[PDB]
Paper text:
[name] ([name]) is a halothane-inhibited and anionic-lipid-activated two-pore domain ([name]) K+ channel implicated in microglial activation and neuroinflammation, and a current target for the treatment of neurodegenerative disorders, for example Alzheimer’s disease and amyothropic lateral sclerosis (ALS). [name] channels are a distinct subset of K+ channels that assemble as dimers to form a pseudo-tetrameric central pore. The overall fold of the channel is similar to that of all other known [name] channel structures; it forms a domain-swapped homodimer, with each subunit containing four transmembrane helices (M1–M4), two pore helices (PH1 and PH2), two selectivity filter (SF) motifs (SF1 and SF2) and two extracellular cap-forming helices (CH1 and CH2).
Here we present a cryogenic electron microscopy (cryo-EM) structure of human [name] at 3.16-Å resolution in combination with a detailed functional analysis. Similar to previous approaches used for [name] channels, we first removed the predicted unstructured carboxy-terminal region of [name] and confirmed that this truncated channel (Gly9–Gly297) was functionally active. The SF adopts a near four-fold symmetry and is similar to that of most other [name] channels, but the intracellular M2–M3 loop (Arg166–Gly189) is longer than that in most [name] channels and was not resolved, presumably owing to its conformational heterogeneity. Specifically, a tyrosine (Y273) on each M4 helix points inwards and, along with I139 on M2, occludes the pore. Also, the Y gate is positioned slightly higher than the X gate, thus creating an even smaller inner vestibule below the SF in [name]. The Y gate completely occludes the permeation pathway in [name], so this conformation is predicted to be closed and non-conductive. By marked contrast, the structure of [name] revealed an unusually large number of positive charges, mostly arginine residues, distributed throughout the cap domain, several of which are the KIS and sit directly above the filter. In particular, the R83 and R87 side chains from each subunit position four positive charges directly above the filter and the S0 K+-binding site, likely influencing K+ permeation through the filter itself and also the extracellular exit pathways that they line. Because this binding pocket is also highly curved, the bound lipid is likely to be a polyunsaturated fatty acid (PUFA), and we found that the omega-3 essential fatty acid, linoleic acid (18:2), fits well into this density.
Residue numbers in the entry:
A (entry chain B), B (entry chain A): 14 to 165, 190 to 295
Amino acid sequence: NEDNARFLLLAALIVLYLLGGAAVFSALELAHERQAKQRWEERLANFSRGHNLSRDELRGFLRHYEEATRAGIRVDNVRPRWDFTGAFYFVGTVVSTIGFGMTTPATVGGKIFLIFYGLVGCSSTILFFNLFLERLITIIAYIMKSCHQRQLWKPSVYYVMLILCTASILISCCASAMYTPIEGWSYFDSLYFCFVAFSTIGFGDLVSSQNAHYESQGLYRFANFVFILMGVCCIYSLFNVISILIKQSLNWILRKMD
Amino acid sequence: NEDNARFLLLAALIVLYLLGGAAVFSALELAHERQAKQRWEERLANFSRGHNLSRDELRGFLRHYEEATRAGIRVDNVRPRWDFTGAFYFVGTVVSTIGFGMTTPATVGGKIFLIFYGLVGCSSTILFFNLFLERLITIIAYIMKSCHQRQLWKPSVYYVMLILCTASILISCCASAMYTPIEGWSYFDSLYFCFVAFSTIGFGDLVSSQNAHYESQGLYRFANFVFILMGVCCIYSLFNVISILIKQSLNWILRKMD
Ligand SMILES: CCCCC/C=C\C/C=C\CCCCCCCC(=O)O
Ligand SMILES: CCCCC/C=C\C/C=C\CCCCCCCC(=O)O
Ligand SMILES: [K+]
Ligand SMILES: [K+]
C-alpha cells in the first residue's frame, strides 16, 4: 500500500540524512575538539607544575566542581536556580520541551513530579501550537482575501511557508538585537541561540537571562519570555509547513517511481 | 468566535499551569540547591586553605575547566565527541530535537550548517512521527477489527491513549533494565532519563552511551538507538492523543460556559 511505501521511503531518507550529517559534522570540527583538549591538557599540566599539585588532588577537586556545577554553580555570577523566577524559567523550558538543562530537578520528589507535569504540560502546549497555527492560517487567509478585495479560498502552502520564513527571520533579528548588547554575545552567537531555542532543540550551551543582575530586570525577563514564545510558535509552524511540502515531495517521488 | 475563545482559554490555562508549576518546584528543591552550594563553598574553602591557593588562582583554573568541559572534557573517561559515532549521536539528538547538548558545534561553520541541517531534519522528522502515528492507528484499527471478528470503524481516542500508555511503560521499563546494569545508574534515574529523552525535553544531565568503553559496544549502541527511537515515537504519539483529549475538554468547558 502506498502509505507503507511512503513510510519506508521516508525512514530510508532520514537514515541517509543522519549518515550524511554525521559525515559532515565530524569533518567540520573534529580538529577543534582535539585542539581544545590539547590546550586543556597543557593548562592542567602548567597548573600541576606551578603549584606542586598532583593530578590526583586536582582530579578530586574537579570532581567536586562537576558536582557543584550540576547544582548550578558557575564562576560567573549566576542567578539562583530555584527561586520563583528560576523555577518559572525551568517550567517554561520543560513545557515548551526546549529543556536547556541549566536548571534540572535533583530531589526524587522533583524527578517524580516532572514526569507528570511535563506529561500534561507538553500535550497542552502541542495543542496550543496547533491552535496557534490554525489561527495564523485563518489570519493569512483573511488578509489575502482583503487584498483580493483591495485589488478591486485558503492560502497555498508555499506562500504560507514564505510568510513564516519572513516572520522567523524578523523575530530572530529583533531578538538578536536585544541579546547582543545585554548578554555580551556576538551577534552570530545570538542568532544561533535564537534558532536553537526556537526550534526547541535547546542544547543549553548558551542560555539568555542568567546573570545575577541586569538593568530593568523585569522588562528584560518579560521581553525574553515574549520573544521565546513568538519564536517557538513561528518556527514550529515552519516545521509543520515544511513537513507538508516534504510529504507532497514523497508522493511525487512514489508517483514517478510507478 | 468559538475558536478564539478556545485559544484564549487555553493560553490562560497554560499560564496558570506555569505559575503553579513554578510555585511547586521552588518548594520541592530550593533547599537542596542551597545545601549543595553551601557544601561547595566549604569544599572550595578547604582546598584553598589546604594547598595555600588563593581564590583568584582557583577561579582562573575553574574558568579554564569551564572552557574545557564545553569542549567535552570530563573527569570520567568520556568518548570523543566528533568521531563519526559521536557525530552520529549528535545529529540523532538534533534531528529528534532531543538536544542533550553534551556535544555541541563550536566552529562558525558548524553553527551555520546546524541552522540548515536542523531546519530540514526536524521538519522531516515531524513528518516521520505523523506517518508513524497514522500507521499505528491503522494497525490498532485492524487488530480491533480482527478481535471483533474473533468474537464471532477506527478506535476511540481513549483506548488509543490507554494502548500508548502501556507501550510507553513497557519500553521505558525495558530501557531502564538495560541502562541500569550497563551505565551504573539507579533504576529510578534511568526511568527519569527515559522520560526526559522520549519526551524530547532532553536536559542532558544524564546521557546514555558515553563512557569510553563498554562490553559489546556495537550491540549496545544499536540497542540504544532502537530504544530511543521507539520511545520518542510512542511518547510523542501519547502527547498528540492527550492533546486531542484536552481539545475536547476545552470544547466541553466552553459549551458548559454557554
Ligand atoms: C500567553 C500564552 C503562554 C503560552 C506558554 C506556552 C509555552 C511556553 C513557551 C515558551 C516560554 C519558555 C521560555 C522562557 C520563559 C521565561 C523567561 C524568563 O523568565 O526569563
Ligand atoms: C529507521 C528510521 C530512523 C528514523 C530516525 C528519526 C529520528 C531520530 C530519533 C532518535 C535517534 C537519536 C537517539 C540517539 C541515536 C544514536 C545512539 C548511539 O549511537 O549511541
Ligand atoms: K529539547
Ligand atoms: K539540553
